[PDB]
């Protein structure tokens, strides 16, 4: 009748460690955890990735977080799976979606 | 599977699984039945005469 699903959560993806950072904050809205950022352009606060800047992903945010957070906590290393990172709807390409952390230490399997 | 990986780049780990459930409660049933006081006084189809 009431099905009820419980499922392991794992968003490590290999046996690296994930390593966090504390960053100041410049988000403009709600942000769950698991969202990829970005250094705002002019002013370098972190801001959600908007999926259409190449190659600026820098972190994943390790905690939900909104606008008034004056610093956001995220990690700087480790591997994550495809399915359990919140992207943005406007990366709407999977073979960016795979290499949008290309060059640091993120990785996406 | 396990397909190839050397031991050298040893990579992708895998994850546990589960997650189902679902409750069947009540159930019952009673068949109630007389005791006949009073069909006893005659005599059964057994009980030989």
């Given at each position: 009748t009431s099905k009820e699903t419980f499922t392991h959560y794992q968003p490590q993806g290999?046996?690296?460690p994930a390593h966090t950072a504390t960053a100041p904050g410049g988000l403009s809205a709600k942000a769950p955890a698991m969202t990829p950022l970005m250094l705002d352009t002019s002013s370098?606060?972190?801001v959600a990735w908007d999926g259409t800047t190449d190659g600026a992903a820098v972190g994943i945010l390790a905690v939900a977080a909104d606008q008034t957070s004056t610093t956001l906590t995220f990690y700087k290393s480790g591997t994550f799976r495809y399915?359990?990172?919140?992207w943005p709807?406007?990366?709407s390409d999977e073979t960016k979606k795979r290499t949008a952390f290309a060059g640091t230490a993120i990785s996406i399997v | 599977?396990?397909?190839y990986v050397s031991p050298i780049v040893s990579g992708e780990v895998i994850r546990s699984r589960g997650g189902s459930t679902s409750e069947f409660t009540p159930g019952y049933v009673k068949p109630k039945?007389?005791?006949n006081p009073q069909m006893t006084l005659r005599r059964?189809?057994?009980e030989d005469p």
């Open positions: 290999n046996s690296d370098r606060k972190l399915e359990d990172v919140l709807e406007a990366a | 599977m396990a397909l039945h007389e005791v059964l189809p057994d």
